[PDB]
Task: structure prediction
Amino acid sequence: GITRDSRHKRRATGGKKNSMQKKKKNTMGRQPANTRLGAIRVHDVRCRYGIIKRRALRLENGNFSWASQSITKGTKILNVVYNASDNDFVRTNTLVKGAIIEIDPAPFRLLACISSRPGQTGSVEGYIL
Amino acid sequence: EQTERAYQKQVFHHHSVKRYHKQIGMGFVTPAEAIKGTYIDKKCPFTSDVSIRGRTLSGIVKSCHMKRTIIVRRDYFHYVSKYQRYEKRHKNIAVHCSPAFRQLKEGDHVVIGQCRPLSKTVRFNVLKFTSRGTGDKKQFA
Amino acid sequence: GRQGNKFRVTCGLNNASTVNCADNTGAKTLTIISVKGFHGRLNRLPRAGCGDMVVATCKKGKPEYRKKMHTAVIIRQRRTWRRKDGVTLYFEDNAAVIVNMKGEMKGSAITGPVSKESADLWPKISSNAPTIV
Amino acid sequence: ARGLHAARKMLAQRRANKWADKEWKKGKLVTRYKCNPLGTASHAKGLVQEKLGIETKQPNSGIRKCVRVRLLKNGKKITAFVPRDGSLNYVNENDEVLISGFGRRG
Amino acid sequence: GRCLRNHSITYKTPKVPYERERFDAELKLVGQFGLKNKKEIQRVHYMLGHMRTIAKVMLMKDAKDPKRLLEGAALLRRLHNL
Amino acid sequence: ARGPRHHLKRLNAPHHWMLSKLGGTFAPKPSHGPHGMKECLPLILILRNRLNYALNGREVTMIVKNRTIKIDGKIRTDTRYPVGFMDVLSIPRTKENFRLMYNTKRRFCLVPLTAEQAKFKLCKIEKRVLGTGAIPYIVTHDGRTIRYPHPELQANDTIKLNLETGKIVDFVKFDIGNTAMMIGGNGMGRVGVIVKREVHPGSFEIVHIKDAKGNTFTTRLNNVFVIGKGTETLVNLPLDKGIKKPLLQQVNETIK
RNA sequence: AUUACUUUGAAUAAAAUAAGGUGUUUAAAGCAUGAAUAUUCAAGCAUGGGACAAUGC
RNA sequence: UAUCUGGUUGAUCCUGCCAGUAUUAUAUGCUGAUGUUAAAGAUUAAGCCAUGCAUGUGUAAGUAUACUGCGGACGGCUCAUUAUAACAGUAAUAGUUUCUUUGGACAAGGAUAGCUUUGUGAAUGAUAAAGAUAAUACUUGAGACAAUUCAUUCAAGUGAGUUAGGAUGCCACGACAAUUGUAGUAACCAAUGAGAAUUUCUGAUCUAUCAAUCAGUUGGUAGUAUCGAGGACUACCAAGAUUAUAACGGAUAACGAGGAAUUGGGGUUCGACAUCGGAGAGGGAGCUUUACAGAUGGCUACCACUUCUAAGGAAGGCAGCAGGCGCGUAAAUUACCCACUUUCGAAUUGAAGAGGUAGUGACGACACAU
Result:
C-alpha cells in the first residue's frame, strides 16, 4: 500500500536512490478518512501490534470545551467555516484539527477550532476562542 | 510575528498569555533577545519542547539563505594509513537556526546539538554562536 | 483438423487485413494473405470469417516469427454476424490464434473472449479460451 | 608532494600511475572475459576442423604439426600444437580435444 | 573458511630446491638419527623458528616490561624442562 | 529477520557461559524473566556444567519439572529459567544450596549457601518512579515491583529484601563511605571502597573505587553494585573475596 | 577558546590471529582450571602536557 | 632465510623486460599400505524438475456417552539485487514498541462440530443438506475502578522538561472468564528490552572517452497518514540543496563485517560459503491470518513454465535434504535414527533431511608399511 519509507525519494544532492529490496510491511499506510458531516458512523481499523483505532468517516456531535467558565457540553456542529491547511476542505465540510467551525450555542448559552484527531481518535473535540 | 495563514500559537501557552522560556542544560545561557522577543518558534530548544541529546558538533556557518535553518561546514581530517599522511575533507550539515540568534551570519562559529528529526535532512539545533570577520556579505538568517 | 460443419458467418476480413494475435507466441499482428478453402471468383479478394483457417504473415513480433507465413484461425471479429437462433452480435476487435494444419494450437493461452463458431470448429482452441461467447 | 597534509595527491598519483603496467592492467580491463578465447578457464574443449603444419622460425627448420580447433563455448578458431612425436595420427576429425594454454602466461 | 575445527602445518619446503651445500648436510643428520625422509628436518626447523621469533620480539624491550616478564618466564620455563 | 529470534548459535552465546565450540550447533536460549540475556546463566547449564548432576540436557527436564529447585521465595518448573545475579538458589532434595556469583576471573561462580542465610536476597534499586495515585515505588535489579518503600530511598541505593515477607529490611546509601562489588566488564569480579565520583553532564558518571589492599580501579556508574556501607560485607563473598590479583600468583602458582 | 598531537583509562560478540596451562601415546587435535587471554585500524567518550602545529581578536 | 639465476655483445659495464623460483586455490595425467581429521553444484545457468521426506502438538488441570489453543513470522538454502544503499565501531529514542516470561448469582442465552440421514463428481487437502449435540468457540450477566481524548491548573529527581504524578470539566472502552483438577481471563504499570524498528558521527573498488546536477527538489506553516519523528503525503509560502575536498552519471565476473592467502618493516590479493547483519524464494504487483510476514514448503491477477484428465476441469513453485536433464575443466547417497546440541507443543513422553551416524571423497591437515 502507501509506504512512508524514504527509499523512493532523492538524496540531499539530487541523486536518485537505487533499490535493494521490495516494500516492507513495517512501512504501512492507510488512505485518509476525511471526517465529513453526517450521521454518527465510526469504523474500527486494526493497526499494528493488535491495537484498535477508532476510524471515523462522519460525525455530527462533538464534545466541546470553553475554559473561561470550565464547561464542556457536547453539541451538534452546523458546518465548517474555514480551514488553515487547505481551502477545498471548507466546501467538503471535512473535520480536521485546527479547522474553524461554527456551532449552535444551545447548551453553551443556557466559532470553534477543532483540537482532536477525528480520523484517529474517532471523536470530535474543540474549544471556543 | 503573526503573518502566516494559520494561527501561529506556541505549544505551551498559559494565561497571565505568558512567554514560556525553559532554561537550557549543559552549561549554556539562554539568549537575552529570546526573552523579550515577540517571535514564535515550535522547534526552538529554549521556547519549545525539543531536547538536545548527547551528540554535539561545531563548525562554521556556510549558508544563511534558508528560513530558520542554516548550513554548517566542518573541515576535519582523515588519516590514510598507508601514506602516514592526512587528507583534508569536509562535511556539510543543516542545523535548525532559532530566531533567537538574530546577528548570526555566514562565517560564524556555531555549537550544534542533536535532536529528533525535524525535516528530511535537518536533525540538529543551534546552541550558541560567535562573531567573526566580514567579507562585505553580512548575510543573516 | 476441424471437427464439424460451420454455419454461415458474414466474412468481414479481406486480403491484407491486419488482425491481432490472441496467442502468447510473441507475435502481435498477422496480415491475412489467403483463406483456406476459399472458392474464388474473378476480381474477388479472399474473405475470412469467424472460425476460418487463414494464411497470414507476421509483420510485428518476435524475430523467429517475424517475416514468415503462418496459419491462423479467427477467434473474434468486428463484423456483425447473425447466429441461427436470431442473435445479432459483434466483438470489439479482430484477433486470430496461430495453429497448424492438424489444429494443434501453437500457444498456450488466449486473451479475451472467443466466438462460439471458432470454438467448436477447433476443439483444441475451446479448452484454452477464458470464455466462449 | 611530501607534505603531511598532501595525502590526496600522492594517492591520486598512484591511482593514475598504476594504469601504465602491462601486467596488472590486464587484470582490470574487461578483455579476459571478452577477447581471450579461454576466458578465465583452465581448459577449453573444442572440435577439429583442419590439420595444418607451421614451419619454425628463422634459425630453426622443420614443420610443426598442428590442428585448427573450434571451441564449443565461444565458437572461435585456435591453432593447437599436437603434443608428441607422431601423435598427429591419434587425433581425428570431429572429436573432443582439450586445449589448455602454454608455458608462457596466457 | 569452511570448518570450525582448526588445522595447522608443520614443514615448509626450502626455497632453493637444489644445493650441494644443503644436500650433503641433510644426510649427515638422516644417517645419524636413522631418519626415514627429509620431512623431519623441516619440522624441527619450524620448531626452532617457532620460539626463535618469540625470543627476538620480547628481547627488544626493557627488562622491566610486564609482558617480557610474564611470557618470558613462561618461555624459559617451558624450554628448560624440555 | 521477520520477528523474534529463537535459536541461539553456540558461538553467539556470551563467553562467560563456559560453553565449548565443538559440542553442538546451538546453545540454550534464556527466556524472558528477571535478568537480561547476557547477564544470566540458563538453569539448564547450571545443573549440567557447574553441578554435573545430569549426563545430558534431557535429564534436566526430569529434575526441574518435579518441582525440585527453589529460587527466591517461590519454586519454578522452567528448564531454561534465566538465573542471573546473586539471587539465592536452593535444592532441598539434595540438602544443598548455592549462590550465583561473579568472580575476578570473569566467570559465574557458585558459593554454597546455608539454610540460615538463604532466607533473604539482596536487590539493587534501578529507578524511583512516582506512579499513579501519588504512589511511589522503585524497580529493582531483578525487575521486582514492590509496594510503598522507604521514602528516604534514592534510585541508586540498595535494599535488603526478604523472600517470604517481601519487605525492606535495611537500606545502604550510595555515598563516599561505602563498599561495592562490580558487575561490569574488566572491573567485574572486583570488590572495593568508593573513594571519588566524577559527574559528566554530557553522557556518563564515572566513579573511582579502591580495593581492600589499596588497589585503585576505575569503572562506570552503571557497573556499581553497593554491597555494604563502611567496608562491611553483608553477604558471603566468593572464595577469592573478589580481589584482583596482579597475575603474579597465577602463572607461577599454577606450575605447582 | 576550540581542533590536532601525545600518555592514560572506560566500554568493547563469539570463532580466529600469537599463545598461558593441559603427555588426545607425540603431533595435527580438543578444552578434556576456561590464561588478565593483548586485539577495537578507522571513528567516538573522560583525562595529565603544550614543544611542534590550523583557526582571528 | 631482509637470498637470486639463464637470456641483447668478439668481450665488458648499465637500463630493461622474458623465463626460471617458492607458496596458496581450481582442474587434470600417473601412482596410491594404513590410522585420525576434513572440503565437496558458486563461478558457465538466482537454469529447468519426475520422485520420497522435511511442522506439528493431549497433561489429572478447555470441550468427550473432532471443536477449540499455539506454532509453521523459528529453523534451513542461495548470494540475484545493492556504491553512503548495506555493513562495522559508536551515540539517541526527553521521537516508538508488542509476543513469551517474571514482579505488581448453588449459574444466563443460545447453534456450530464429532456420529450420522440422503449424496453429487473422473479427479482437486473436491464439495451438497437434512438431527441433535458441548465450550476456556460466541454474546450476556454482575460481583467494584483502572487506562485513553480533549480545554484548563499545583507544579520536583532530571545534564536538560508546564515532565513522572496530582486536581478539575467531560467523552469513551470498561473489567477480576457464569473458569477446569479429584491451574484459566480482562485490562493497566515495570522489567525481560544493551532486544525489534527508526536515527547521530566516521569509514568503500575503478572511472572525468561522466562537469555541472536536483523541481517534492531545499526549508517553513497547517493538517493527514503511520505504533512512532519526518515532504512520508497533502494545500499554501520563499528559492532553495549538492558541486574541483570529485556533485550527478557509468562498470564490476560487489552481499558487508568478524576474517583468509602472503608477508623483515611497509604492504598486495581474496571473503557466496562456520558466526553476526542484509536481501530473495521463476518476475514484479496486490493482500489474508496474527504480537512480529508485503509470509510464497499462505492466497489472487498478469508474463513464462510443469502435472493429471472421462476433453467438462483440477494445482505447482526442490535458491530445503537426496536425486534427474542441461551447463560446463569443475563438484557426493534418490540411507538410517531424534542418542548427543537445540527448537516447537494442549508441555517430564509427541515432532524435526535442524542435528547425529553411515556412504563416495588424492581439495586439503597430522603420525606413518616397504
Notes: The longest helix of chain D spans residues 8-17. Residues 56 and 62 of chain D are 6 Å apart (CA to CA). The two ends of chain D are 38 Å apart (CA to CA).
